[PDB]
């Protein structure tokens, strides 16, 4: 479950971070990276809590 969770867009432009970085401009990038970071963090915390 933890590994698979990496494949979800979490509301951003695209799941794959190497494309979000390489597509949008930085001042725009921060936004689309934000939801991705928060989603992956919350997944990691659920994992460690169980």
């Amino acid at each position: 479950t933890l590994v698979k969770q990496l494949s979800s867009n979490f509301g951003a432009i695209s799941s794959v971070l190497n494309d979000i970085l390489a597509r949008l401009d930085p001042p725009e990038a921060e936004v689309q990276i934000d939801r991705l970071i928060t989603g992956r963090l919350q997944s990691l915390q659920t994992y460690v809590t169980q």
Partner: protein
């Protein structure tokens, strides 16, 4: 670079990608579509209007 270094045009606002480094991504398909309107309605070329 021909299109985005020709400043003669009036609006260049790109969605999901960015102009200056559009010369970086390799694309599946690109569709060119053209039409004629009044210059009031450049706000109606917009997602959600």
């Amino acid at each position: 670079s021909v299109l985005y270094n020709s400043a003669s045009f009036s609006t260049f606002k790109c969605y999901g990608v960015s102009p200056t480094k559009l010369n970086d991504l390799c694309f599946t398909n690109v569709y060119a579509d053209s039409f004629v309107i009044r210059g009031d309605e450049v706000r109606q070329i917009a997602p959600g209007q």
